[PDB]
Ligand binder design. Structure first.
Ligand SMILES: COc1cccc(OC)c1-n1c(NS(=O)(=O)[C@@H](C)[C@H](O)c2ncc(C)cn2)nnc1-c1cccc(C)n1
Ligand SMILES: CCCCCCCC/C=C\CCCCCCCC(=O)OC[C@H](O)CO
Ligand SMILES: [Zn+2]
Length: 347
């Protein structure tokens, strides 16, 4: 348990430090549309790793904060700011893939570069405003131990004499809504509309090169616009060379940007679902009144839920090295940079 957290800090600073460097090293006119959200995700994951030496020492001494009041406020604020920001970056990535693949409006009216620049400014402004009450409510002090001080959320500042639970559940449910429920629903809607257009795959002639598009079809021969290639009558031949349906190959479009988007979302959902499910169940446990044995599990699973959420911060650079070919190409170029460095030092 303590050795695992120490490994995350080592893989986080070097991992996210590489991701941030690879995007910045790329040319001004050679940058991808998704790169603006990739760079912002790297900044969010990097600052998330900076809060680990404050959190790991706190867990070692079993809930003890020897840093201060301002450090308890800032670290807790940065943890939640980056919690919303990383989720909003994936929302931007999914919407970027939606506007490009689906295309709801005209190509000139879409403004993909403009929309991306607007979304990145709005997400960083929202993440700071939404996580703002966290910094205000967080304060250091003795709870029961007296000799050992702990950094906790003190609801007494805004709540009345009995509405202390109401604010914990009020801010708690909204955090799951803003940070997971709303972004994941947009993520699911984007993926659904993307798969909807892809559903009817293109077929190309291996003889002449006729690119059959299911959207346009072939109304000159009899194929209605919207007919799938498999739904086409068996008597139909190529309108350019007259070859059978058996001489056509399926267009397996190498959608690399969607592969980076899906993998990052799936891994995020696997690392954010146990943290958000245990939290919501604990908040609902006081209102719905769940059994004594059920609440005992959630209290012991939660410190491990915060562990797997920290894993996601250092797991992302590994995913860029397995599915993204652009990051793999810049990695080899980084060793070539070190090869010219050793060649310039001796010549
Ligand atoms: C803002 O970081 C903190 C700093 C110090 C202590 C903390 O506490 C565990 C957090 N913290 C908090 N506070 S909490 O809301 O008061 C929390 C204690 C809540 O009462 C609760 N829920 C579920 C159960 C079963 C019991 N009790 N919630 N999440 C995190 C967190 C931590 C690390 C990484 C991530 C992604 N998140
Ligand atoms: C203004 C919107 C406030 C959102 C609530 C929030 O940031 O979440 C607090 C959370 O309960 C802390 O653990
Ligand atoms: Zn043909």
């Amino acid at each position: 348990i303590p050795a695992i957290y120490m490994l995350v800090f080592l893989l986080g600073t070097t991992g996210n430090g590489l991701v941030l460097w690879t995007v910045f090293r790329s040319s001004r006119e050679k940058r991808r549309s998704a790169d603006i959200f990739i760079a912002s995700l790297a900044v969010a994951d990097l600052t998330f790793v900076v809060t680990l030496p404050l959190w790991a020492t706190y867990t070692y001494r079993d809930y003890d904060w020897p840093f201060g009041t301002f450090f308890c406020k800032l670290s807790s604020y940065l943890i939640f700011v980056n919690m919303y920001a990383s989720a909003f970056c994936l929302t931007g990535l999914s919407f970027d893939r939606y506007l490009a693949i689906v295309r709801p409006v005209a190509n000139a009216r879409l403004r993909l570069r403009v929309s991306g620049a607007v979304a990145t400014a709005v997400l960083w402004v929202l993440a700071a405003l939404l996580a703002m009450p966290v910094m205000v409510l967080r304060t250091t002090g003795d709870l029961c131990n007296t000799n050992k001080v702990q950094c906790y959320m003190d609801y007494s500042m805004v709540a009345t004499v009995s509405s202390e639970w109401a604010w914990e559940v009020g801010l708690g449910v909204s955090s799951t809504t803003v940070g997971f429920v709303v972004p994941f629903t947009i993520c699911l809607t984007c993926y659904f509309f993307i798969a909807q257009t892809i559903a009817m795959k293109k077929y190309t002639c291996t003889v002449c090169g006729y690119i059959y598009n299911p959207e346009d079809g072939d109304p000159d021969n009899g194929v209605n616009p919207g007919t799938d290639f498999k739904d086409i009558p068996d008597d139909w031949v190529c309108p350019l060379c007259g070859v059978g349906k058996d001489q056509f190959e399926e267009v397996e479009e190498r959608r690399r940007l969607l592969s980076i988007c899906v993998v990052l979302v799936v891994t995020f959902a696997l690392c954010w679902m146990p943290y958000h499910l245990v939290k919501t169940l604990y908040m609902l446990g006081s209102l719905l009144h769940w059994p004594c044995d059920f609440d005992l599990f959630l209290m012991n699973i939660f410190p491990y839920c915060t562990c797997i959420s920290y894993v996601n911060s250092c797991l992302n650079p590994f995913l860029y090295a397995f599915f993204d070919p652009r990051f793999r190409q810049a990695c080899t170029s980084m060793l070539l940079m070190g090869q010219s460095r050793l060649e310039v030092l001796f010549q």
